């Protein structure tokens, strides 16, 4: 897997069934962390 802007993504060209049917794929694997729920503030539901 390469490193497109700090996010690790993996190519893996898939299998072949017909004669002209290449059909690639691509994908990644995320997770987000929010330690120390002290510094966080929200002002939910503004008129907008």
């Amino acid at each position: 897997a390469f490193s497109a802007n700090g996010v690790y993504t993996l190519m893996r060209q898939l299998a072949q069934t017909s004669l002209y049917v290449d059909n690639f794929v691509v994908g990644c694997i995320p997770q987000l962390q929010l330690t120390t729920r002290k510094n966080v503030g929200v002002i939910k539901n503004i008129k907008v």
Binding site: T17, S18, L19, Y20, V21
Partner: protein, 50 residues
């Protein structure tokens, strides 16, 4: 078989051309012939034949 389908095709069925045997038997029969000639008649046949 070489059929025509598409170019977004579906890879058609198998072909497997075949060979066959012939087997031509020989070892049964024969063509023969016999004589059955005596021993006295071959001695007088050097006399009464010109």
């Amino acid at each position: 078989t070489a059929t025509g389908v598409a170019i977004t095709g579906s890879a058609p069925a198998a072909s497997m051309d075949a060979t066959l045997p012939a087997q031509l038997p020989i070892s049964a029969a024969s063509v023969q012939s016999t004589f059955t000639l005596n021993l006295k008649e071959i001695e007088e046949s050097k006399e009464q034949v010109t």
